[PDB]
Structure formats: C-alpha cells, structure tokens
Amino acid sequence: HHHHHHMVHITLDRNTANSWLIISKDRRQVRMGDTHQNVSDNKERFSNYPMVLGAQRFSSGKMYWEVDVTQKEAWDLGVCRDSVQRKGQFSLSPENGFWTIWLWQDSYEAGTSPQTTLHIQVPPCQIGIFVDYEAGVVSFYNITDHGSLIYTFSECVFAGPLRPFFNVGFNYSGGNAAPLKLCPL
Ligand SMILES: CS(=O)(=O)N[C@H]1CCOC2(CCCC2)C1
C-alpha cells in the first residue's frame, strides 16, 4: 500500500470514553483502569465495553492512521458512524454502523455478521487503517509485516459522518492491561 500520504492526526474524545478508561494528556494513548476513573456519566459514553471514539469526524476524502497494539490479548479497531448505539449490549457489524477487526482468544476476525476469520501469519504490533469515504472502503494493514493487507470492507454504506473507533478490551486475565497508542506520522 502507498496510503501513508493520507495520514491524519487522530486524538481521542474523553467525553465518549467508557468511565474506566484512562486517556493520556496528549489524547494519543488509552488503557483500561482498575476502577471507575471518577468522571460524570453522559449519553455519549460507551457503558458496557471499554470503548472510545476519536474526536475527528470524516464525511469525505481519504484518511489513514496507525495504532500500536503491542502485547495486547484483545482489542477492536476501525471506524464507526457518529450515531452508533452507546448504551447496553450490541454486536460490531456494518448493520449497526461499525467497520472493525479484532483480536480475541488468539484469533483475528473482521466484524462482519457473522464474523470473518482473518489469515495473519505475523501477529501485528501496529495496524494501519485506511478509509476512502467516496469509494465506500475501509482497509486494514499489518505494519509489522511490511504493510500486508489484513482485510477490506467494500460496498460500505457509511450513512453518516465516521469517527475512529477503539476498544482496549477487558482485562479479566491480567494479560491485557497494555494501552492502544496512536503512532506518529
Ligand atoms: C476489564 S476488567 O478489568 O475485568 N474490569 C471490568 C469489569 C466489568 O465492568 C467494567 C467493564 C467496562 C465498565 C466497567 C470493568
């Protein structure tokens, strides 16, 4: 891929964060805290899962960013509609306004309904995410493996502004405390 030149500087939106998340001062890193982080509730916060949105909204053009997932056991990454459900239980699917991949229990899967098995030979430490709004494309790249393609959602029906989407995952195991980090341009 030669998508690097559409690089955008993403920052995390604290107001959307689940109340257990800790976002760094520079708004470029997020991790699971071991308790509630002492913020008020609001209608934007994801209540059931350790999720947060980027501050940026995209309604046109080509955008690219990279996320560090080093030593995590579980996470979700991609984009979503600005209008996605925040409260209660839901599945990550294009029908619900999400275009995502994840790691869970030693397998990588794309968030289709039902989910799609991914074929990754080199476990990634950094993921590249490419959005072409007009084309209806979301693609994922393995930066650890020389940028190899992981997955392409095509024929996407965005149906609204898009936001960068993050899930740091649960830490029931004690092996998933590490942060998601937005990597420098
Ligand atoms: C991931 S964890 O460290 O096992 N603790 C979680 C237990 C379930 O509730 C939460 C999930 C998000 C809201 C609060 C914390």
mmCIF file of all heavy atoms in Angstrom, residues 10 17 24 29 31 37 40 53 74-76 96 176 183:
data_model
loop_
_atom_site.group_PDB
_atom_site.id
_atom_site.type_symbol
_atom_site.label_atom_id
_atom_site.label_comp_id
_atom_site.label_asym_id
_atom_site.label_seq_id
_atom_site.Cartn_x
_atom_site.Cartn_y
_atom_site.Cartn_z
ATOM 1 N N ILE A 10 -4.966 11.761 14.628
ATOM 2 C CA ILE A 10 -6.177 11.412 15.405
ATOM 3 C C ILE A 10 -5.912 11.702 16.897
ATOM 4 O O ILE A 10 -4.816 11.441 17.348
ATOM 5 C CB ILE A 10 -6.535 9.930 15.174
ATOM 6 C CG1 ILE A 10 -6.850 9.641 13.699
ATOM 7 C CG2 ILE A 10 -7.688 9.537 16.084
ATOM 8 C CD1 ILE A 10 -7.865 10.549 13.049
ATOM 9 N N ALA A 17 -15.595 8.258 26.150
ATOM 10 C CA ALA A 17 -14.896 7.096 26.735
ATOM 11 C C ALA A 17 -15.770 6.378 27.754
ATOM 12 O O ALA A 17 -16.375 7.043 28.632
ATOM 13 C CB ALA A 17 -13.611 7.528 27.360
ATOM 14 N N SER A 24 -4.379 9.512 27.912
ATOM 15 C CA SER A 24 -3.167 10.286 28.222
ATOM 16 C C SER A 24 -3.405 11.779 27.954
ATOM 17 O O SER A 24 -4.321 12.166 27.255
ATOM 18 C CB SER A 24 -2.038 9.729 27.418
ATOM 19 O OG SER A 24 -2.313 9.900 26.030
ATOM 20 N N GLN A 29 -3.085 8.074 23.675
ATOM 21 C CA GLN A 29 -3.000 6.733 24.276
ATOM 22 C C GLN A 29 -4.206 6.495 25.180
ATOM 23 O O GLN A 29 -4.754 7.457 25.794
ATOM 24 C CB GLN A 29 -1.734 6.546 25.112
ATOM 25 C CG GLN A 29 -0.473 6.955 24.395
ATOM 26 C CD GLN A 29 0.738 6.481 25.164
ATOM 27 O OE1 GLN A 29 0.649 5.631 26.053
ATOM 28 N NE2 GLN A 29 1.865 7.079 24.860
ATOM 29 N N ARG A 31 -5.827 3.315 27.977
ATOM 30 C CA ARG A 31 -5.783 1.992 28.619
ATOM 31 C C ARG A 31 -6.955 1.861 29.602
ATOM 32 O O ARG A 31 -7.573 2.838 30.000
ATOM 33 C CB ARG A 31 -4.455 1.781 29.344
ATOM 34 C CG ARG A 31 -4.283 2.695 30.542
ATOM 35 C CD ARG A 31 -2.867 2.514 31.095
ATOM 36 N NE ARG A 31 -2.630 3.387 32.222
ATOM 37 C CZ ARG A 31 -2.856 3.078 33.469
ATOM 38 N NH1 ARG A 31 -3.440 1.946 33.801
ATOM 39 N NH2 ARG A 31 -2.565 4.001 34.404
ATOM 40 N N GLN A 37 -13.001 5.881 36.766
ATOM 41 C CA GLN A 37 -11.999 6.954 36.736
ATOM 42 C C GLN A 37 -12.575 8.306 37.176
ATOM 43 O O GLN A 37 -11.936 9.371 36.933
ATOM 44 C CB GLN A 37 -11.343 7.002 35.347
ATOM 45 C CG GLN A 37 -10.513 5.793 35.086
ATOM 46 C CD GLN A 37 -9.455 5.509 36.113
ATOM 47 O OE1 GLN A 37 -9.304 4.406 36.649
ATOM 48 N NE2 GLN A 37 -8.692 6.529 36.429
ATOM 49 N N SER A 40 -18.183 12.147 35.518
ATOM 50 C CA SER A 40 -19.655 12.077 35.454
ATOM 51 C C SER A 40 -20.103 11.239 34.265
ATOM 52 O O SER A 40 -19.366 11.137 33.246
ATOM 53 C CB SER A 40 -20.235 13.472 35.383
ATOM 54 O OG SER A 40 -19.795 14.128 34.205
ATOM 55 N N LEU A 53 -14.143 6.880 21.152
ATOM 56 C CA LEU A 53 -14.066 7.403 19.757
ATOM 57 C C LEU A 53 -12.944 8.402 19.609
ATOM 58 O O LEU A 53 -12.584 9.174 20.569
ATOM 59 C CB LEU A 53 -15.366 8.075 19.325
ATOM 60 C CG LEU A 53 -16.592 7.197 19.453
ATOM 61 C CD1 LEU A 53 -17.855 7.850 18.887
ATOM 62 C CD2 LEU A 53 -16.391 5.854 18.769
ATOM 63 N N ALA A 74 -6.472 -8.688 23.538
ATOM 64 C CA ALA A 74 -7.817 -8.432 22.998
ATOM 65 C C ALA A 74 -7.961 -6.944 22.719
ATOM 66 O O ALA A 74 -7.497 -6.091 23.521
ATOM 67 C CB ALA A 74 -8.895 -8.845 23.960
ATOM 68 N N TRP A 75 -8.625 -6.618 21.607
ATOM 69 C CA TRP A 75 -8.918 -5.209 21.192
ATOM 70 C C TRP A 75 -9.785 -5.249 19.958
ATOM 71 O O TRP A 75 -9.877 -6.286 19.277
ATOM 72 C CB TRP A 75 -7.629 -4.455 20.872
ATOM 73 C CG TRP A 75 -6.642 -5.123 19.965
ATOM 74 C CD1 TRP A 75 -5.545 -5.827 20.330
ATOM 75 C CD2 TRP A 75 -6.656 -5.277 18.522
ATOM 76 N NE1 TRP A 75 -4.848 -6.324 19.279
ATOM 77 C CE2 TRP A 75 -5.544 -6.038 18.128
ATOM 78 C CE3 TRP A 75 -7.539 -4.833 17.497
ATOM 79 C CZ2 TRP A 75 -5.222 -6.325 16.808
ATOM 80 C CZ3 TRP A 75 -7.264 -5.165 16.184
ATOM 81 C CH2 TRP A 75 -6.104 -5.880 15.857
ATOM 82 N N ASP A 76 -10.489 -4.158 19.725
ATOM 83 C CA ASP A 76 -11.227 -3.915 18.448
ATOM 84 C C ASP A 76 -10.695 -2.596 17.890
ATOM 85 O O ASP A 76 -10.524 -1.631 18.664
ATOM 86 C CB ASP A 76 -12.728 -3.800 18.651
ATOM 87 C CG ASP A 76 -13.429 -4.793 19.539
ATOM 88 O OD1 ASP A 76 -13.007 -5.908 19.505
ATOM 89 O OD2 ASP A 76 -14.412 -4.405 20.208
ATOM 90 N N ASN A 96 -24.975 -2.343 12.285
ATOM 91 C CA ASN A 96 -25.025 -1.490 13.483
ATOM 92 C C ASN A 96 -24.107 -0.275 13.336
ATOM 93 O O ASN A 96 -24.026 0.521 14.271
ATOM 94 C CB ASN A 96 -24.660 -2.289 14.750
ATOM 95 C CG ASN A 96 -25.729 -3.252 15.187
ATOM 96 O OD1 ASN A 96 -26.901 -3.128 14.798
ATOM 97 N ND2 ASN A 96 -25.329 -4.255 15.955
ATOM 98 N N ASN A 176 -3.920 -8.186 29.625
ATOM 99 C CA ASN A 176 -4.396 -7.235 28.606
ATOM 100 C C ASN A 176 -4.404 -5.795 29.124
ATOM 101 O O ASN A 176 -5.158 -4.982 28.580
ATOM 102 C CB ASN A 176 -5.777 -7.606 28.080
ATOM 103 C CG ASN A 176 -6.073 -6.946 26.749
ATOM 104 O OD1 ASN A 176 -5.159 -6.772 25.929
ATOM 105 N ND2 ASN A 176 -7.327 -6.551 26.589
ATOM 106 N N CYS A 183 0.096 6.066 16.667
ATOM 107 C CA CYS A 183 1.531 6.173 16.278
ATOM 108 C C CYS A 183 1.765 7.471 15.543
ATOM 109 O O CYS A 183 0.947 7.903 14.768
ATOM 110 C CB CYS A 183 1.914 5.114 15.270
ATOM 111 S SG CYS A 183 1.486 3.440 15.733
#
